[PDB]
Design a protein around this ligand. Sequence first.
Ligand code: A1AS5
Ligand code: NAG
Ligand code: NAG
Ligand code: NAG
Ligand code: NAG
Ligand code: NAG
Ligand code: NAG
Ligand code: NAG
Ligand code: NAG
Ligand code: NAG
Ligand code: NAG
Length: 337
Amino acid sequence: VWKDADTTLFCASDAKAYETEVHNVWATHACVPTDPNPQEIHLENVTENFNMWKNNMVEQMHEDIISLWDQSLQPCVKIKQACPKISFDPIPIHYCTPAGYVILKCNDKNFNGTGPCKNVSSVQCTHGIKPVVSTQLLLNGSLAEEEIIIRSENLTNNAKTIIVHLNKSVEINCTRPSNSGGDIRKAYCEINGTKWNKVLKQVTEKLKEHFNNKTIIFQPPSGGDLEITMHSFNCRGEFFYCNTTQLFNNTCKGCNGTITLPCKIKQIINMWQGTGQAMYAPPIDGKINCVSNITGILLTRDGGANNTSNETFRPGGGDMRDNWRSELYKYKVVQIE
Ligand SMILES: N=C(N)NCC(=O)N1CCC[C@H](C(=O)Nc2ccc(Cl)c(F)c2)C1
Ligand SMILES: *[C@@H]1O[C@H](CO)[C@@H](O)[C@H](O)[C@H]1NC(C)=O
Ligand SMILES: *[C@@H]1O[C@H](CO)[C@@H](O)[C@H](O)[C@H]1NC(C)=O
Ligand SMILES: *[C@@H]1O[C@H](CO)[C@@H](O)[C@H](O)[C@H]1NC(C)=O
Ligand SMILES: *[C@@H]1O[C@H](CO)[C@@H](O)[C@H](O)[C@H]1NC(C)=O
Ligand SMILES: *[C@@H]1O[C@H](CO)[C@@H](O)[C@H](O)[C@H]1NC(C)=O
Ligand SMILES: *[C@@H]1O[C@H](CO)[C@@H](O)[C@H](O)[C@H]1NC(C)=O
Ligand SMILES: *[C@@H]1O[C@H](CO)[C@@H](O)[C@H](O)[C@H]1NC(C)=O
Ligand SMILES: *[C@@H]1O[C@H](CO)[C@@H](O)[C@H](O)[C@H]1NC(C)=O
Ligand SMILES: *[C@@H]1O[C@H](CO)[C@@H](O)[C@H](O)[C@H]1NC(C)=O
Ligand SMILES: *[C@@H]1O[C@H](CO)[C@@H](O)[C@H](O)[C@H]1NC(C)=O
């Protein structure tokens, strides 16, 4: 019979030893060997409150990824050191409670993150979470089981980030083609405009429910730095900055074929870890391709709309805890009393 507590967690994964990919190397020396068998138990007739915005597991994961990137993705300049090209493809990470501690997991299929949960169970580990770092769009995550879910520590307060949990993924295919000749930094992502705009209309329809039927408008970000005005993400080791203006086109339809986002590979990065600007080596040679699932969106809601008929939303990002938070929302650690 538990109690809300914070225990230092431990990680488990199916990482391959002697693999050159940095996620496998970190998981091999930092997550449990052992090869565990965690198990579930339904808590019959039981209800419990959750808060995905006040979750210590979020900061536990955040400590891991920061440690993983510092050991694996070293910048040439911060400090003037080595910076080799590395193998980079995130793998799932499971988080597990030690003895005397359990994770409580919400099985409500329309759970929004905060509040009471009816289908509560106790598990030893979380599901496999891929630690994908990105802005504006959440990549390669899990999908909402039933409806599109709007997540917010408080949807009335405009200062609190919103996580849109898509119930169906939209594939985005980013490439920096090969061939000493030309701007080797130019890149691009291709998206199905028909697919994407169908989902964006469903997000628009779901946002309308929350804001007493109100013209929902999308505006590319003004404030913030390159990594948050642009859709940012690491692909095979390289830092990608993609202009997402075509995705938040309030127009869209003579406009629903293949959308091509212009991208760039950047060398000097304002680190998501807070540690400032850091410079990496120029792009590797050859075809750099990543095909990912868009599984969520990060939005800010403009202020000063209480006397209008419109709500205006902008793609956000910047705090990676929101990314971990988007996959850990159904969990909470509790000390077994
Ligand atoms: N200053 C404080 N308190 N925290 C750091 C901060 O304030 N940050 C916002 C300022 C810049 C940073 C960013 O998010 N960098 C980034 C880099 C590469 C990729 Cl792939 C990505 F998704 C994101 C993070
Ligand atoms: C989430 O659901 C709970 C139900 O108890 C509600 O109190 C809260 O306002 C909801 N938040 C959002 C953003 O839907
Ligand atoms: C709880 O979730 C399980 C699967 O996770 C499923 O049978 C159903 O959605 C719920 N069942 C009960 C008994 O609450
Ligand atoms: C992408 O989503 C599809 C279905 O939406 C899923 O079957 C597939 O495993 C996902 N891929 C990744 C890398 O998550
Ligand atoms: C996703 O959610 C919307 C409601 O927001 C619903 O209309 C749509 O049918 C759902 N799609 C799937 C594939 O379940
Ligand atoms: C959410 O929004 C505002 C806080 O500024 C207020 O109207 C409301 O009571 C808040 N509720 C919670 C649970 O934070
Ligand atoms: C992704 O785009 C590249 C460049 O156009 C292409 O060669 C590759 O086949 C695409 N991937 C898929 C799965 O279509
Ligand atoms: C784009 O998505 C629509 C939505 O169903 C689909 O019918 C169409 O085949 C897709 N286009 C391509 C080129 O895959
Ligand atoms: C409610 O929003 C819809 C768009 O989904 C719009 O067509 C309709 O006119 C709105 N209703 C009112 C009363 O403004
Ligand atoms: C992104 O691209 C669109 C059109 O491709 C352009 O209108 C917009 O100015 C670009 N964003 C920035 C910050 O330059
Ligand atoms: C998403 O997963 C796919 C398949 O596992 C992989 O090819 C791709 O590189 C991943 N995307 C990112 C941004 O890590």
